[PDB]
Ligand binder design. Structure first.
Ligand SMILES: Cc1cc2nc3c(=O)[nH]c(=O)nc-3n(C[C@H](O)[C@H](O)[C@H](O)CO)c2cc1C
Ligand SMILES: Cc1cc2nc3c(=O)[nH]c(=O)nc-3n(C[C@H](O)[C@H](O)[C@H](O)CO)c2cc1C
Ligand SMILES: Cc1cc2nc3c(=O)[nH]c(=O)nc-3n(C[C@H](O)[C@H](O)[C@H](O)CO)c2cc1C
Lengths: 265, 265, 265
């Protein structure tokens, strides 16, 4: 990847490795969307659009030759920059085990948050529709631990009436889960009951939403399309610091809206 | 090519061959643009857009993460229909050499004219710019046969001052050429003089323009991009007739505007 | 060639190739002197002077030991600089076919003009004498197309009286050639007559002179001596631009002044 001009920066191999290994760890645990969707393999740094499969007509009614245009989806590209310090970085060659790298982490968190916002709520100027926008898949619930177990059993019937099968998964907030655990105290464990009602499912707690939703994981309903994965590169040299950046290119879409249910409580 | 539903029409092999061979001949001689441009090979019935290689910025000035969208060109698709007669078509099996096929020819001519209009004058709603739009490549001429020979020699100097080489070609109207031939009568032939001033070039007469232009043919300056070539297919059956159609998908662009000169007289 | 510090510039192989290929084309057609002289092979970046073969005496008349110094010609070295833009250059990796490179071309033209001026008119401070300085090889002509054909036939006799043979070539201005072509209109072609009078020669039109001259091309009368050919290198990096330069080292001389005739009209 020669468009990332790495070999013109005054660093060594050990310093490059130390920089990469720290960002990999945080990206592993802070990307919540990539836990239950599909990913389509990289195409390259020159890919530009993804086809939809239709045509719109722009000619009159009485003409002999008739014509129109094809339709597609554009990709999104991002870039974010930060700085580091050379004397502090150079203590690694004298044998120091712990070095200060706070700016890197602070930037990584914001990039992850930006990426999740599009999957959960969509983008207006690009023509993307998110999960929380389908308002014909909502059902009502209550505020006691009993209504949750009622609602799961009600949802599985609607799933069966449409032909959808496979393992099922629950995605829920964190404070509500803690409140439920506090309210149910001194009795049979609640995780066991929930997994038995799901018939061998899973629970995922996140701070990105405000209520709960239920999905199926047979495969082929939510797609994320990548051109280039997340990468780090070099920009310029200041008086006694260096400047680096992070980049990526992507888009997202939803195919079958019948494998998703929203709970309101 | 199974999207052209040919095998559901009540015809035989000889009738299909007779229909194809007549259209090929007229398409060979009525497509004037394809004589001096480049053609990029077919990509398929699902190709949708062609990339340009840029990005436009849509974020604010003070933000930490910045983003934009990629850019491309959409393709154009066309379709035209006509009808034929079964009893008249069926005399071919009794041994008749000449059959009436006038509607086919009348439709082929209009399709060819539509295709040439875009190359010579562009399309507003698709973002295409044509040859006659570059107004900084014009020079002046006169109305006598002497000024043409002066203008060619003047143009070759401007060609040499930019680094452009290769064989050269002249494209001119028809009535003006006939008038020049009438005005020069009883002297040395004019084609020989013109080709000697071009230093071994060629002359092309067409009814599509109104003046003359000079181009170079080294290769790599005018591109035509095809998805699917021109094809014939079947639609439905009327009381005692049949209905067929013609289709294609394409786009066009100009790379180096320095291999083109326009003459005004 | 390691004195051209190329590998310290933030560019890639494709960008270097794109920069070289454009300058080669313009240098090919804008160097007019190198069409009918001889070139002596490169000697290196350390060559400094070329010997003439004489000695001048600096001692008195009555002395017992007598001495002097040898004589030679010094070489000329040049350098010219320009700047380019990084974001615009970086669109080549996204797939763009046409990039802006105007400063390079504007500098190349001036370097070519500087080089031709020395061959055609000489240098005072270096001790070089040019072609248009030999005033004992001039003959007179007129302003009609007939006098040119008379003058060529007169010149070949003077050539034969000295022992000079070989193919012959005519070098002439451009506006005068166009005026001659306009004045001779409607008759036998003029290029054929001129080449027949030259007995199988060639014609070269240039904007560098004001009249015509006739030369012979048997070999060994006009020499151009090179130390290093034309080259491109890297200087420094500005805020968001880069700085590059062009260099060369040469000299020139005339051996036999009897293979050259000047026409005045
Ligand atoms: C013993 C010593 C070691 C130093 N080591 C480094 C170093 O590894 N990196 C660095 O950037 N500056 C270092 N400096 C400081 C450097 O000489 C200077 O302060 C700045 O590089 C420019 O003023 C060092 C200074 C001293 C006295
Ligand atoms: C001797 C004869 C031959 C015919 N051949 C054809 C034929 O080849 N194709 C056809 O469409 N109709 C043909 N017809 C006409 C057909 O029977 C009828 O007019 C229409 O097909 C429906 O009314 C023929 C009629 C006759 C009397
Ligand atoms: C999406 C995006 C892509 C960019 N690409 C480049 C680039 O390829 N080269 C460049 O010099 N600057 C680029 N810049 C601008 C760069 O971040 C910044 O403007 C200057 O490099 C220093 O301010 C880009 C900016 C954005 C937002």
């Amino acid at each position: 990847m020669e468009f990332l001009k790495r070999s013109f920066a005054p660093l060594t191999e050990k310093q490059w490795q130390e920089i990469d290994n720290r960002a990999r760890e945080i990206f592993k645990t802070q990307l919540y969307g990539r836990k239950f969707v599909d990913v389509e393999g990289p195409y390259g740094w020159e890919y530009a659009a993804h086809p939809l499969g239709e045509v719109e007509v722009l000619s009159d009614e009485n003409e002999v030759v008739k014509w129109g245009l094809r339709k597609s989806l554009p990709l999104i590209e991002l870039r974010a920059t930060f700085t580091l310090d050379l004397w502090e970085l150079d203590n690694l060659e004298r044998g120091k085990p712990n070095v200060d790298l706070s700016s890197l982490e602070e930037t990584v968190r914001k990039v992850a948050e930006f990426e999740d916002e599009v999957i959960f709520r969509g983008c207006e100027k690009s023509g993307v529709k998110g999960l929380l926008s389908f308002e014909e898949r909502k059902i009502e619930c209550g505020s006691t631990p009993k209504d949750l177990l009622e609602a799961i059993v009600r949802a599985l019937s609607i799933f069966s009436k449409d032909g959808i099968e496979g393992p099922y998964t629950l995605v829920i907030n964190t404070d509500r889960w803690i409140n439920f655990l506090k309210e149910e105290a001194g009795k049979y464990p609640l995780e066991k009951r929930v997994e038995e009602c799901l018939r061998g499912g899973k629970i995922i707690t996140t701070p990105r939403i405000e209520d709960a939703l239920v999905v199926s994981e047979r495969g082929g309903d939510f797609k994320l399309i990548l051109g280039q994965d997340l990468s780090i590169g070099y920009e310029d040299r200041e008086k006694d610091a260096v400047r680096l950046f992070i980049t990526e290119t992507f888009t997202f879409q939803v195919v079958n809206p019948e494998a998703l249910i929203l709970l309101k409580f």
